[PDB]
Short mmCIF file of all heavy atoms in Angstrom, two decimals:
data_model
loop_
_atom_site.label_atom_id
_atom_site.label_comp_id
_atom_site.label_asym_id
_atom_site.label_seq_id
_atom_site.Cartn_x
_atom_site.Cartn_y
_atom_site.Cartn_z
N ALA A 144 -51.17 -24.54 -3.78
CA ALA A 144 -50.48 -25.04 -4.96
C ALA A 144 -49.04 -25.49 -4.77
O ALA A 144 -48.62 -26.33 -5.55
CB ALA A 144 -50.46 -23.99 -6.06
N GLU A 145 -48.31 -25.02 -3.75
CA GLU A 145 -46.89 -25.32 -3.59
C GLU A 145 -46.40 -26.77 -3.70
O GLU A 145 -45.25 -26.99 -4.08
CB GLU A 145 -46.43 -24.67 -2.27
CG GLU A 145 -44.94 -24.54 -1.96
CD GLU A 145 -44.09 -23.73 -2.94
OE1 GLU A 145 -44.34 -22.54 -3.15
OE2 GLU A 145 -43.14 -24.29 -3.48
N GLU A 146 -47.22 -27.80 -3.43
CA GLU A 146 -46.83 -29.21 -3.55
C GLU A 146 -45.68 -29.72 -2.67
O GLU A 146 -45.29 -29.12 -1.67
CB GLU A 146 -46.57 -29.58 -5.02
CG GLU A 146 -47.78 -29.96 -5.85
CD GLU A 146 -47.50 -30.08 -7.35
OE1 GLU A 146 -46.45 -30.60 -7.75
OE2 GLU A 146 -48.35 -29.64 -8.12
N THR A 147 -45.20 -30.93 -2.96
CA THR A 147 -44.02 -31.52 -2.34
C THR A 147 -43.49 -32.45 -3.43
O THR A 147 -44.26 -33.22 -4.00
CB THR A 147 -44.34 -32.37 -1.09
OG1 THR A 147 -45.13 -31.58 -0.19
CG2 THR A 147 -43.07 -32.82 -0.37
N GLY A 148 -42.20 -32.41 -3.81
CA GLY A 148 -41.67 -33.31 -4.84
C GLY A 148 -40.14 -33.34 -4.91
O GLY A 148 -39.49 -32.44 -4.38
N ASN A 149 -39.50 -34.38 -5.48
CA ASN A 149 -38.04 -34.39 -5.63
C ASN A 149 -37.68 -33.43 -6.76
O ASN A 149 -38.28 -33.42 -7.84
CB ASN A 149 -37.48 -35.81 -5.87
CG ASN A 149 -35.96 -35.96 -5.69
OD1 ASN A 149 -35.21 -35.00 -5.75
ND2 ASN A 149 -35.39 -37.14 -5.49
N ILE A 150 -36.69 -32.57 -6.55
CA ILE A 150 -36.52 -31.38 -7.39
C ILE A 150 -35.30 -31.60 -8.29
O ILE A 150 -34.28 -30.92 -8.14
CB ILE A 150 -36.42 -30.17 -6.39
CG1 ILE A 150 -37.74 -29.98 -5.65
CG2 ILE A 150 -36.02 -28.86 -7.03
CD1 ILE A 150 -37.71 -28.96 -4.49
N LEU A 151 -35.36 -32.61 -9.18
CA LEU A 151 -34.13 -33.11 -9.79
C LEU A 151 -33.39 -32.09 -10.64
O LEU A 151 -32.15 -32.02 -10.65
CB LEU A 151 -34.35 -34.37 -10.63
CG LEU A 151 -34.68 -35.73 -10.00
CD1 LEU A 151 -33.65 -36.11 -8.96
CD2 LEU A 151 -36.08 -35.77 -9.42
N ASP A 152 -34.16 -31.23 -11.31
CA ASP A 152 -33.56 -30.31 -12.26
C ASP A 152 -33.31 -28.93 -11.64
O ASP A 152 -34.24 -28.34 -11.09
CB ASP A 152 -34.42 -30.21 -13.54
CG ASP A 152 -33.84 -29.37 -14.68
OD1 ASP A 152 -32.70 -28.93 -14.60
OD2 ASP A 152 -34.56 -29.14 -15.65
N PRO A 153 -32.10 -28.35 -11.70
CA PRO A 153 -31.77 -27.05 -11.17
C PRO A 153 -32.56 -25.96 -11.82
O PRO A 153 -32.62 -24.86 -11.26
CB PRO A 153 -30.26 -26.91 -11.31
CG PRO A 153 -29.75 -28.36 -11.22
CD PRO A 153 -30.92 -29.20 -11.77
N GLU A 154 -33.16 -26.23 -12.99
CA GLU A 154 -33.95 -25.27 -13.71
C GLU A 154 -35.11 -24.92 -12.85
O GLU A 154 -35.69 -23.84 -12.97
CB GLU A 154 -34.50 -25.82 -15.04
CG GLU A 154 -35.34 -24.80 -15.82
CD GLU A 154 -34.40 -23.74 -16.39
OE1 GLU A 154 -33.16 -23.91 -16.27
OE2 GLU A 154 -34.92 -22.74 -16.96
N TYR A 155 -35.47 -25.84 -11.94
CA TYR A 155 -36.59 -25.71 -11.06
C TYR A 155 -36.43 -24.46 -10.25
O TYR A 155 -37.41 -23.81 -9.90
CB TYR A 155 -36.70 -26.88 -10.06
CG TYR A 155 -37.90 -26.65 -9.22
CD1 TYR A 155 -39.14 -27.06 -9.66
CD2 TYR A 155 -37.80 -26.03 -7.99
CE1 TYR A 155 -40.26 -26.85 -8.89
CE2 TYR A 155 -38.92 -25.83 -7.22
CZ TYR A 155 -40.15 -26.23 -7.67
OH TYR A 155 -41.30 -26.02 -6.88
N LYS A 156 -35.17 -24.08 -9.93
CA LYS A 156 -34.89 -22.95 -9.09
C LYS A 156 -35.49 -21.70 -9.68
O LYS A 156 -35.97 -20.83 -8.95
CB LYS A 156 -33.38 -22.68 -8.96
CG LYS A 156 -32.59 -23.86 -8.39
CD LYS A 156 -33.02 -24.28 -6.98
CE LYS A 156 -32.25 -25.49 -6.46
NZ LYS A 156 -30.82 -25.16 -6.31
N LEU A 157 -35.45 -21.57 -11.01
CA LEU A 157 -35.93 -20.46 -11.78
C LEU A 157 -37.43 -20.36 -11.80
O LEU A 157 -37.99 -19.34 -12.19
CB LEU A 157 -35.38 -20.45 -13.22
CG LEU A 157 -33.87 -20.16 -13.23
CD1 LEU A 157 -33.08 -21.26 -12.51
CD2 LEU A 157 -33.36 -19.89 -14.66
N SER A 158 -38.13 -21.44 -11.39
CA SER A 158 -39.56 -21.53 -11.48
C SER A 158 -40.24 -20.35 -10.87
O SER A 158 -41.32 -19.96 -11.32
CB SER A 158 -40.13 -22.76 -10.75
OG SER A 158 -39.58 -23.95 -11.29
N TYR A 159 -39.65 -19.72 -9.83
CA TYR A 159 -40.33 -18.61 -9.24
C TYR A 159 -40.50 -17.55 -10.29
O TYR A 159 -41.54 -16.89 -10.34
CB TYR A 159 -39.62 -18.02 -8.00
CG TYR A 159 -38.24 -17.56 -8.35
CD1 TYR A 159 -38.02 -16.28 -8.81
CD2 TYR A 159 -37.17 -18.41 -8.20
CE1 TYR A 159 -36.74 -15.86 -9.11
CE2 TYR A 159 -35.89 -18.00 -8.51
CZ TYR A 159 -35.68 -16.72 -8.96
OH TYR A 159 -34.37 -16.29 -9.28
N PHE A 160 -39.47 -17.32 -11.12
CA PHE A 160 -39.56 -16.37 -12.20
C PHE A 160 -40.43 -16.85 -13.33
O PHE A 160 -41.38 -16.18 -13.72
CB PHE A 160 -38.18 -16.03 -12.80
CG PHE A 160 -38.34 -15.04 -13.90
CD1 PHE A 160 -38.19 -13.69 -13.66
CD2 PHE A 160 -38.63 -15.44 -15.19
CE1 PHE A 160 -38.33 -12.77 -14.66
CE2 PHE A 160 -38.78 -14.52 -16.20
CZ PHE A 160 -38.63 -13.18 -15.94
N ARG A 161 -40.15 -18.06 -13.86
CA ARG A 161 -40.80 -18.53 -15.06
C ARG A 161 -42.27 -18.76 -14.85
O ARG A 161 -43.08 -18.41 -15.71
CB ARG A 161 -40.20 -19.85 -15.58
CG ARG A 161 -38.80 -19.67 -16.19
CD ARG A 161 -38.18 -20.95 -16.75
NE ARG A 161 -37.78 -21.81 -15.60
CZ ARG A 161 -38.68 -22.67 -15.04
NH1 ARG A 161 -39.96 -22.73 -15.51
NH2 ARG A 161 -38.29 -23.47 -14.00
N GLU A 162 -42.63 -19.38 -13.72
CA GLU A 162 -43.97 -19.75 -13.37
C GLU A 162 -44.80 -18.60 -12.86
O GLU A 162 -46.01 -18.75 -12.71
CB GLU A 162 -44.05 -20.91 -12.37
CG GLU A 162 -43.63 -22.23 -13.02
CD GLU A 162 -44.03 -23.38 -12.10
OE1 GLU A 162 -44.86 -23.14 -11.19
OE2 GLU A 162 -43.52 -24.51 -12.31
N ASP A 163 -44.18 -17.45 -12.52
CA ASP A 163 -44.90 -16.36 -11.91
C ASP A 163 -46.13 -16.02 -12.70
O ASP A 163 -46.12 -15.96 -13.93
CB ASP A 163 -44.08 -15.07 -11.79
CG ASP A 163 -44.91 -14.04 -11.04
OD1 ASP A 163 -45.18 -14.26 -9.83
OD2 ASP A 163 -45.29 -13.01 -11.67
N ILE A 164 -47.25 -15.82 -11.97
CA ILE A 164 -48.54 -15.52 -12.52
C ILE A 164 -48.52 -14.18 -13.20
O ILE A 164 -49.05 -14.03 -14.30
CB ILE A 164 -49.61 -15.52 -11.46
CG1 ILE A 164 -51.00 -15.39 -12.10
CG2 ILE A 164 -49.27 -14.42 -10.43
CD1 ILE A 164 -52.15 -15.65 -11.12
N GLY A 165 -47.90 -13.17 -12.56
CA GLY A 165 -47.90 -11.83 -13.07
C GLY A 165 -47.19 -11.74 -14.38
O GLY A 165 -47.64 -11.03 -15.28
N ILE A 166 -46.06 -12.45 -14.51
CA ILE A 166 -45.25 -12.40 -15.70
C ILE A 166 -46.03 -12.94 -16.86
O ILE A 166 -46.03 -12.35 -17.94
CB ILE A 166 -44.03 -13.27 -15.57
CG1 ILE A 166 -43.14 -12.86 -14.39
CG2 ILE A 166 -43.29 -13.22 -16.91
CD1 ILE A 166 -42.45 -11.51 -14.56
N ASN A 167 -46.71 -14.08 -16.66
CA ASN A 167 -47.43 -14.71 -17.73
C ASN A 167 -48.54 -13.81 -18.18
O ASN A 167 -48.79 -13.66 -19.37
CB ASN A 167 -48.07 -16.05 -17.31
CG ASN A 167 -46.97 -17.09 -17.16
OD1 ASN A 167 -46.15 -17.29 -18.06
ND2 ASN A 167 -46.94 -17.79 -15.99
N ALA A 168 -49.22 -13.17 -17.21
CA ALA A 168 -50.34 -12.33 -17.51
C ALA A 168 -49.88 -11.18 -18.34
O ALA A 168 -50.54 -10.81 -19.32
CB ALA A 168 -51.01 -11.75 -16.26
N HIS A 169 -48.73 -10.59 -17.99
CA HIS A 169 -48.22 -9.44 -18.69
C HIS A 169 -47.99 -9.79 -20.12
O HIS A 169 -48.39 -9.04 -21.01
CB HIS A 169 -46.86 -8.99 -18.12
CG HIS A 169 -46.21 -7.91 -18.93
ND1 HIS A 169 -46.55 -6.58 -18.88
CD2 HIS A 169 -45.21 -8.00 -19.84
CE1 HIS A 169 -45.74 -5.94 -19.76
NE2 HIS A 169 -44.91 -6.76 -20.36
N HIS A 170 -47.37 -10.95 -20.37
CA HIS A 170 -47.01 -11.35 -21.70
C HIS A 170 -48.25 -11.47 -22.52
O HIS A 170 -48.26 -11.10 -23.70
CB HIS A 170 -46.24 -12.68 -21.71
CG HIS A 170 -45.64 -13.04 -23.04
ND1 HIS A 170 -46.02 -14.13 -23.79
CD2 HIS A 170 -44.68 -12.41 -23.76
CE1 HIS A 170 -45.27 -14.10 -24.92
NE2 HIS A 170 -44.44 -13.08 -24.95
N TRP A 171 -49.33 -12.00 -21.93
CA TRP A 171 -50.56 -12.11 -22.65
C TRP A 171 -51.01 -10.74 -23.04
O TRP A 171 -51.30 -10.49 -24.21
CB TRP A 171 -51.69 -12.70 -21.77
CG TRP A 171 -53.07 -12.62 -22.37
CD1 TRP A 171 -53.97 -11.60 -22.26
CD2 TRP A 171 -53.71 -13.64 -23.15
NE1 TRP A 171 -55.13 -11.91 -22.94
CE2 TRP A 171 -54.98 -13.17 -23.49
CE3 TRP A 171 -53.28 -14.87 -23.55
CZ2 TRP A 171 -55.84 -13.92 -24.24
CZ3 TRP A 171 -54.15 -15.63 -24.31
CH2 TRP A 171 -55.40 -15.16 -24.65
N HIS A 172 -51.02 -9.80 -22.08
CA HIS A 172 -51.57 -8.50 -22.33
C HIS A 172 -50.78 -7.76 -23.36
O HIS A 172 -51.35 -7.09 -24.22
CB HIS A 172 -51.63 -7.62 -21.06
CG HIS A 172 -52.51 -8.20 -19.99
ND1 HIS A 172 -53.87 -8.39 -20.12
CD2 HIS A 172 -52.19 -8.64 -18.74
CE1 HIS A 172 -54.30 -8.93 -18.96
NE2 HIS A 172 -53.32 -9.10 -18.09
N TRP A 173 -49.44 -7.87 -23.33
CA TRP A 173 -48.62 -7.10 -24.22
C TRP A 173 -48.97 -7.44 -25.64
O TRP A 173 -49.13 -6.56 -26.47
CB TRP A 173 -47.12 -7.38 -24.03
CG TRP A 173 -46.22 -6.50 -24.85
CD1 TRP A 173 -45.59 -5.34 -24.50
CD2 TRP A 173 -45.88 -6.75 -26.22
NE1 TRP A 173 -44.86 -4.86 -25.56
CE2 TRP A 173 -45.03 -5.71 -26.63
CE3 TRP A 173 -46.23 -7.75 -27.07
CZ2 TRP A 173 -44.53 -5.67 -27.90
CZ3 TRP A 173 -45.72 -7.71 -28.35
CH2 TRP A 173 -44.89 -6.69 -28.76
N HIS A 174 -49.12 -8.74 -25.95
CA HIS A 174 -49.41 -9.13 -27.30
C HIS A 174 -50.73 -8.55 -27.71
O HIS A 174 -50.94 -8.27 -28.88
CB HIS A 174 -49.46 -10.66 -27.50
CG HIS A 174 -48.10 -11.29 -27.52
ND1 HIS A 174 -47.34 -11.41 -28.66
CD2 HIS A 174 -47.35 -11.83 -26.52
CE1 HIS A 174 -46.18 -12.01 -28.30
NE2 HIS A 174 -46.14 -12.29 -27.01
N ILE A 175 -51.68 -8.41 -26.76
CA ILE A 175 -52.96 -7.82 -27.06
C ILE A 175 -52.82 -6.37 -27.44
O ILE A 175 -53.51 -5.91 -28.35
CB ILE A 175 -53.96 -7.87 -25.94
CG1 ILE A 175 -54.64 -9.25 -25.84
CG2 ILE A 175 -54.96 -6.72 -26.16
CD1 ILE A 175 -53.74 -10.41 -25.42
N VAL A 176 -51.98 -5.60 -26.72
CA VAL A 176 -51.84 -4.21 -27.07
C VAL A 176 -51.18 -4.08 -28.40
O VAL A 176 -51.53 -3.18 -29.17
CB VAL A 176 -51.08 -3.38 -26.07
CG1 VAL A 176 -51.90 -3.33 -24.77
CG2 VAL A 176 -49.67 -3.94 -25.87
N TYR A 177 -50.19 -4.94 -28.71
CA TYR A 177 -49.57 -4.85 -30.01
C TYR A 177 -49.79 -6.14 -30.74
O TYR A 177 -48.92 -7.00 -30.74
CB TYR A 177 -48.05 -4.66 -29.95
CG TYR A 177 -47.77 -3.33 -29.33
CD1 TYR A 177 -47.72 -3.20 -27.96
CD2 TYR A 177 -47.58 -2.22 -30.12
CE1 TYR A 177 -47.47 -1.97 -27.38
CE2 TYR A 177 -47.33 -0.99 -29.55
CZ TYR A 177 -47.27 -0.87 -28.18
OH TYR A 177 -47.01 0.39 -27.59
N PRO A 178 -50.91 -6.29 -31.41
CA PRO A 178 -51.13 -7.53 -32.11
C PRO A 178 -50.32 -7.61 -33.37
O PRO A 178 -50.12 -6.59 -34.02
CB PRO A 178 -52.64 -7.67 -32.30
CG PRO A 178 -53.22 -6.31 -31.85
CD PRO A 178 -52.16 -5.76 -30.89
N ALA A 179 -49.86 -8.82 -33.72
CA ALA A 179 -49.07 -9.07 -34.89
C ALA A 179 -49.91 -8.82 -36.11
O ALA A 179 -49.42 -8.37 -37.14
CB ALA A 179 -48.57 -10.53 -34.97
N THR A 180 -51.20 -9.16 -36.00
CA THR A 180 -52.21 -9.07 -37.01
C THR A 180 -52.58 -7.65 -37.31
O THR A 180 -53.19 -7.39 -38.34
CB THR A 180 -53.47 -9.81 -36.65
OG1 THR A 180 -54.05 -9.24 -35.49
CG2 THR A 180 -53.12 -11.28 -36.41
N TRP A 181 -52.28 -6.71 -36.39
CA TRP A 181 -52.68 -5.33 -36.46
C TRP A 181 -52.52 -4.78 -37.85
O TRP A 181 -51.44 -4.83 -38.44
CB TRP A 181 -51.88 -4.43 -35.51
CG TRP A 181 -52.27 -2.98 -35.49
CD1 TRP A 181 -51.79 -1.93 -36.22
CD2 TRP A 181 -53.28 -2.43 -34.62
NE1 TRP A 181 -52.43 -0.77 -35.87
CE2 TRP A 181 -53.36 -1.06 -34.88
CE3 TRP A 181 -54.08 -3.02 -33.69
CZ2 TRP A 181 -54.24 -0.26 -34.21
CZ3 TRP A 181 -54.97 -2.21 -33.01
CH2 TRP A 181 -55.04 -0.86 -33.27
N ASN A 182 -53.63 -4.26 -38.41
CA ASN A 182 -53.62 -3.65 -39.71
C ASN A 182 -53.98 -2.21 -39.49
O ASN A 182 -55.09 -1.89 -39.07
CB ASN A 182 -54.68 -4.24 -40.66
CG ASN A 182 -54.44 -3.67 -42.05
OD1 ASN A 182 -54.17 -2.48 -42.21
ND2 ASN A 182 -54.52 -4.55 -43.08
N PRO A 183 -53.04 -1.34 -39.73
CA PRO A 183 -53.29 0.05 -39.51
C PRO A 183 -54.30 0.65 -40.43
O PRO A 183 -54.94 1.62 -40.03
CB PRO A 183 -51.92 0.73 -39.55
CG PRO A 183 -50.96 -0.37 -39.09
CD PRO A 183 -51.64 -1.68 -39.52
N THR A 184 -54.44 0.13 -41.65
CA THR A 184 -55.37 0.73 -42.56
C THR A 184 -56.76 0.54 -42.04
O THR A 184 -57.55 1.47 -42.01
CB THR A 184 -55.33 0.11 -43.93
OG1 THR A 184 -55.73 -1.25 -43.86
CG2 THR A 184 -53.90 0.22 -44.48
N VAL A 185 -57.07 -0.69 -41.60
CA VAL A 185 -58.40 -1.00 -41.18
C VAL A 185 -58.77 -0.19 -39.98
O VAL A 185 -59.81 0.47 -39.96
CB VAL A 185 -58.57 -2.44 -40.81
CG1 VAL A 185 -60.01 -2.66 -40.31
CG2 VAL A 185 -58.19 -3.30 -42.03
N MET A 186 -57.92 -0.22 -38.93
CA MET A 186 -58.21 0.52 -37.74
C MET A 186 -58.14 1.98 -38.04
O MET A 186 -58.98 2.76 -37.58
CB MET A 186 -57.23 0.22 -36.59
CG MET A 186 -57.58 -1.06 -35.82
SD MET A 186 -57.42 -2.62 -36.76
CE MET A 186 -57.93 -3.70 -35.39
N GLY A 187 -57.14 2.37 -38.84
CA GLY A 187 -56.93 3.74 -39.19
C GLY A 187 -55.82 4.23 -38.33
O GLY A 187 -54.97 5.00 -38.78
N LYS A 188 -55.78 3.78 -37.06
CA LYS A 188 -54.74 4.24 -36.21
C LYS A 188 -53.60 3.28 -36.32
O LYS A 188 -53.77 2.14 -36.73
CB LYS A 188 -55.12 4.39 -34.73
CG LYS A 188 -55.36 3.09 -33.97
CD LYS A 188 -55.39 3.31 -32.45
CE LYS A 188 -55.58 2.03 -31.63
NZ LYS A 188 -55.62 2.36 -30.18
#
């Protein structure tokens, strides 16, 4: 996946952080553990 390209924007430097697979996955999971929709009455917990 690494590619080859002209890297015009310095924001690109951050890509290792922003693009990281683990980070994205975590964010997905976190929302799952604490859903916005969560209704305590229905679940009970």
Side-chain angles (χ1 to χ4, degrees):
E145 193 60 60
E146 275 170 40
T147 307
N149 194 340
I150 294 171
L151 290 306
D152 185 7
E154 180 72 7
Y155 181 85
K156 301 299 178 65
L157 291 63
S158 300
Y159 59 88
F160 180 95
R161 289 181 287 87
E162 290 193 16
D163 185 66
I164 188 169
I166 301 291
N167 287 308
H169 172 79
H170 189 244
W171 169 272
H172 298 296
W173 185 96
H174 284 273
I175 280 67
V176 294
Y177 294 85
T180 62
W181 182 268
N182 189 317
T184 64
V185 177
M186 279 66 180
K188 71 166 182 181

